[PDB]
Design a protein around this nucleic acid. Structure first.
Ligand SMILES: [Mg+2]
Lengths: 237, 444
DNA sequence: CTCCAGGGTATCTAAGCTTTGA
RNA sequence: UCAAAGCUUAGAUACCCUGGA
């Protein structure tokens, strides 16, 4: 039924509400958001303010976590604004995109603890904290002393005020030196170009291991704002 | 309504051959003859090589294309012989005019080829050289002969040596031959424009096309070209010629739109009823303002951003493994579209161009590619309620013109490809006098 | 009111590979 | 560069922002 790899929302992304904090150093604020993405604070640094949503009902707990993380980076900050801003995803696509990706990172991090018990060191899921978005690395190889890894990359788009998450299978190379070899490229093509059945089953496994049934994915951005997205499975005209 | 999808039957994007023959397989040029033709006068210029190379050039350009005794396969047709027998063109070449060009210093190649190049006797000048020389002199030669009547057709030593496999000997000749009968002035085929009706059904099959593409290099500097296209079932007029980013400044975009309008007007002067503008990057604000300023409400327009690098993948049917038919279209309309305000994004159409296809059995056999299809995303902006199915069909037929890939195995938009090539070539042109209007055949 | 340097996310152009077109 | 496809890499660009001059 022409099933795809895209998980789309069903209604228009309801009005988002985010709490802002005044930060005087954007550069370290980016590292701050990267770090706090693990504790349930999904935020983006814009206009000197960290705008974020959270899944923590304890205001004191959230305040303590943010304050500690900000002190660790030598940042002068202010108090939480408690619904500082209202964001329609369509008007501000990057705000929603970054908050959504941070929430997805948090969900994947939470699932990692329980989807890695029965695994080997060459099959343990991880999140690559490098120059990319969300990347779940789940297969490792040392081909000719060249370290490579197969994983699933996630991307988010907002179209017609609706969220669309694309998960696909990508291979990456973390070798500091240059390839300069043809056998390595031959092997990398051998294992990175596959029929659309290794790829489809790879995507299915990736989604199932983090959301149970893979017909849908639920990503919680706040105590009341949850993106419940479904795979298309469109039949025909 | 909402997000839906379908599969476009392959026999709906047909192309026209001689005697107005409609068929969806460009290789049927071997059965329906080229839509247009011109006598070919080859000048096979060879660069320093070895005896085997010259023997291979003789084998390719004489035994296959001239000698009727050599019964070459020429698929889809039982006819055997040279081009003059299979296609219906005045192919001319003798294995004694091949020139033994040699070089020993930088810049000798271009000068030697210019001296050995002849105008009155020859209109196609094949060039044969090793990759080391072609890779670094091809763009310069193309720029040097731009506008002139000497259209070159390069060939590498590896391609000639491939002719000994007997598998490549049955697939390399024909695609090259079409190029020949396109670089002598011929038109291997054109694209049936009736599909344009499915676009809107409120305008004839005619129209206008324009694809802005960017060439990066220019000695570490972004550049671009424009490209033009038009069809009426009898005319083609494919002319293609012309920045701190992958966008057209407002001034340049206004000038480009006006120049395209004037070009179409010089063609027939009917004030183009429709302006389709392909682009390989998102509609910048400058381009949006330029489109509003020049087109406004006078002309109906459709700005199609063709995103190749996309994350969307399409499988399905769970029975033929998970392979997807070639012509699959996923349409998503956008309700939040243009309340006469300035929000022009109309819909999004994801089309697969490479997948399962049924080409004729030559004696239909299902065929597939290696890997997984990479569909294209058609981010459509429009000032009217355009039909996404018509846009998808138009884009498919646009992929098919391409007198360099006679097949249904490609996905790139031809207008954008040749615009990018023209942008790369612009590097080495120092005279913008006759440049304003040159043919695609120069940079084919 | 104008650039350059930075950040995050998403693309784009250009290079190197493999395969494919009987 | 007979053509294409589907991979991976490098850099660059666009959208929002920050700093400086
Ligand atoms: Mg050529």
């Amino acid at each position: 039924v022409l099933e795809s790899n895209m998980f789309k929302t069903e209604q228009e992304l309801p009005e988002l509400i985010v709490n802002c904090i005044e930060i005087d150093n954007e550069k370290e604020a980016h590292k701050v958001v990267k770090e706090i993405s693990k504790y349930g604070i999904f935020g983006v640094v814009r206009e000197k303010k960290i705008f974020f949503t959270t899944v923590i009902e304890d205001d004191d707990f959230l305040k303590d976590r943010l304050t500690e993380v900000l002190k660790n980076y030598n940042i002068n900050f202010s108090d939480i604004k408690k619904n500082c801003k209202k964001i329609i995803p369509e008007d501000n696509k990057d705000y929603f995109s970054q908050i959504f990706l941070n929430a997805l990172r948090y969900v994947i991090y939470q699932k990692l603890e329980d989807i890695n018990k029965d695994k080997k060191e060459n099959e343990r899921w991880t999140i690559n904290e490098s120059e990319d978005g969300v990347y779940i690395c789940k297969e490792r190889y040392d081909i000719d002393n060249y370290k490579i890894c197969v994983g699933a990359k996630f991307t988010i788009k907002v179209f017609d005020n609706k969220a669309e998450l694309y998960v696909d299978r990508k291979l990456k190379l973390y070798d500091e030196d240059k390839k300069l070899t043809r056998k390595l490229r031959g092997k990398i093509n051998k294992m990175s170009v596959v029929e659309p059945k290794t790829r489809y089953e790879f995507i299915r496994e990736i989604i199932q291991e983090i959301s149970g049934n893979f017909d849908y994915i639920n990503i919680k951005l706040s105590k009341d704002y949850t993106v419940n997205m479904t795979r298309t499975k469109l039949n025909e005209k | 309504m909402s997000e839906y999808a379908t599969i476009l039957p392959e026999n709906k994007i047909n192309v026209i051959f001689r005697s107005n023959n409609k068929y969806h397989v460009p290789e049927f040029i071997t059965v329906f003859k080229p839509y247009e033709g011109r006598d070919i006068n080859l000048q096979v210029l060879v660069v320093n090589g070895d005896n085997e190379i010259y023997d291979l050039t003789k084998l390719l350009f004489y035994e296959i294309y001239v000698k009727d005794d050599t019964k070459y396969p020429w698929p889809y047709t039982k006819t055997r012989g040279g081009i003059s027998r299979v296609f219906g063109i005045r192919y001319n070449f003798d294995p004694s005019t091949i020139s033994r060009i040699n070089i020993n210093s930088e810049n000798d190649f271009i000068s030697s080829i210019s001296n050995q190049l002849d105008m009155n006797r020859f209109n196609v000048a094949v060039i044969i050289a090793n990759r080391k020389l072609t890779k670094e002199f091809h763009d310069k030669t193309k720029a040097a002969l731009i506008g002139s009547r000497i259209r070159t057709q390069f060939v590498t030593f590896t391609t000639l040596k491939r002719l000994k496999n007997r598998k490549y000997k049955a697939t390399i000749p024909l695609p090259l031959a079409v190029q020949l009968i396109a670089k002598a002035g011929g038109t291997p085929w054109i694209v049936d424009s009736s599909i344009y009706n499915d676009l809107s059904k409120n305008v004839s099959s005619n129209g206008m096309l324009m694809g802005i593409a960017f060439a990066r290099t220019r000695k570490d500097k972004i550049t671009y070209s424009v490209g033009y296209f038009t069809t009426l079932n009898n005319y083609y007029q494919r002319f293609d010629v012309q920045t701190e980013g992958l966008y057209v400044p407002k001034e340049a975009m206004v000038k480009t739109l006006e120049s395209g309008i004037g070009w179409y007007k010089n063609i027939i002067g009917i004030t183009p009823p429709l302006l389709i503008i392909f682009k390989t990057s998102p509609m910048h604000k400058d381009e949006k303002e330029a489109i509003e300023a020049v087109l406004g409400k006078d002309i109906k327009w459709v700005f199609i951003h063709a995103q190749y690098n996309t994350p969307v993948r399409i499988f399905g049917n769970k029975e033929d493994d998970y392979k997807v038919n070639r012509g699959t279209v996923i349409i998503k309309k956008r309700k939040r579209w243009n309340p006469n305000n300035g929000d022009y994004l109309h819909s999004e159409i994801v089309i697969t161009a490479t997948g399962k296809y049924r080409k004729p059995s030559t004696k239909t056999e299902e065929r597939y590619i290696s890997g997984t299809p990479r569909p294209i995303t058609l981010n459509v902006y429009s000032s009217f309620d355009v039909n996404p199915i018509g846009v998808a069909e138009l884009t498919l037929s646009q992929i098919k013109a391409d007198w360099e890939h006679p097949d249904i195995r490609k996905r790139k938009i031809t207008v954008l490809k040749y615009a990018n090539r023209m942008a790369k070539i612009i590097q080495y042109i120092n005279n913008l006098s006759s440049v304003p209007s040159v043919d695609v055949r120069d940079v084919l």
